[PDB]
Amino acid sequence: DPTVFHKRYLKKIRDLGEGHFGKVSLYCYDPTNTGEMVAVKALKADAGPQHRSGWKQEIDILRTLYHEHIIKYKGCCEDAGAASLQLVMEYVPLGSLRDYLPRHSIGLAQLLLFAQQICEGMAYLHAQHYIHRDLAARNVLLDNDRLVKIGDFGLAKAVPEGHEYYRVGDSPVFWYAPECLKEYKFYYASDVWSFGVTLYELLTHCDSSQSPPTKFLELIGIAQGQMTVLRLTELLERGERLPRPDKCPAEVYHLMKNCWETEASFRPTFENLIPILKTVHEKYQG
Numbered sequence: 001d002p003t004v005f006h007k008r009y010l011k012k013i014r015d016l017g018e019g020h021f022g023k024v025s026l027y028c029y030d031p032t033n034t035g036e037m038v039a040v041k042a043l044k045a046d047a048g049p050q051h052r053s054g055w056k057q058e059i060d061i062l063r064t065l066y067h068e069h070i071i072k073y074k075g076c077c078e079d080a081g082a083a084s085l086q087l088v089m090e091y092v093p094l095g096s097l098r099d100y101l102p103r104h105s106i107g108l109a110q111l112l113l114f115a116q117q118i119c120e121g122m123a124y125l126h127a128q129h130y131i132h133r134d135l136a137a138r139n140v141l142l143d144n145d146r147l148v149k150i151g152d153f154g155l156a157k158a159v160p161e162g163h164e165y166y167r168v169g170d171s172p173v174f175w176y177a178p179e180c181l182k183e184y185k186f187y188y189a190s191d192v193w194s195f196g197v198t199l200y201e202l203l204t205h206c207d208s209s210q211s212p213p214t215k216f217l218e219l220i221g222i223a224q225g226q227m228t229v230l231r232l233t234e235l236l237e238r239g240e241r242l243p244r245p246d247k248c249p250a251e252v253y254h255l256m257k258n259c260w261e262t263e264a265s266f267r268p269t270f271e272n273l274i275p276i277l278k279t280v281h282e283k284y285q286g
């Protein structure tokens with residue numbers, strides 16, 4: 001059953017973040033009056049046809065998802081001037097792990113709990129026959145209780161019923177498995193590769209000097225898209241991998257490497273990752 005927010009009662013507070021197709025801002029929704037704080041995401045200015053269709057897909061997908069570790073869809077708002085809907089979501093005031101981790105002292109057990117929660121949301125997503133396609137620390141958000149909420153479903157897709165992959169502008173190539181780069185196939189297992197990269201980001205505390213783009217660009221250089229993807233594919237097929245983060249346990253690095261098996265069918269499922277991460281979280285907790 002639909003929920004409609006009325007622009008007449010939305011009062012902008014501040015900007016929060018920029019995703020693939022939309023910008024997110026904080027609003028007070030006050031049909032009285034104070035009222036509820038909500039996040040509102042709107043189609044970016046100068047959006048072309050391809051962007052409007054991506055944006056429509058994002059709203060359609062998020063409208064169907066309902067889980068403790070997926071950012072909560074609240075409703076939509078019409079913007080008649082844009083001829084487009086605006087997406088209203090819960091407000092999660094700690095923002096993304098990309099912005100949070102560099103600014104706080106966080107232990108290994110906490111990082112592994114974040115990872116477990118990411119796997120729980122992703123196991124749910126895959127249950128529902130969607131792939132995310134940009135599973136990266138920038139898109140993992142934290143609520144006031146530091147509970148993980150996966151966000152930015154801008155690239156997400158329904159995997160055609162009867163299949164284990166979706167056949168695929170600017171892609172987040174430094175988070176992508178070789179089959180995505182080379183075969184233009186995005187499997188459920190391709191999101192698991194991306195999770196491995198995200199886990200690497202968590203263990204490096206989202207330090208920019210250690211980031212996946214920094215590490216790969218050191219080897220590939222700035223180049224055109226096609227050349228970048230070719231060079232990246234070659235490195236990955238030859239077994240090149242992101243290094244073990246300082247202070248990362250051997251078994252946690254082995255977990256990353258398993259998520260980065262070149263052959264997709266050898267990677268763990270998100271369902272299996274849940275108890276694996278639970279186990280290592282408890283181990284390093286006490």
Ligand SMILES: CC(C)(C)c1nc2c3ccc(F)cc3c3c(=O)[nH]ccc3c2[nH]1
Nearest residue numbers: 016017018019039090091092093095152
């Ligand atoms: C970059 C991206 C599109 C993933 C994004 N950033 C935020 C965000 C950043 C800081 C903050 F305090 C809140 C949010 C936020 C939010 O509160 N709700 C929904 C999405 C979202 C968000 N979505």
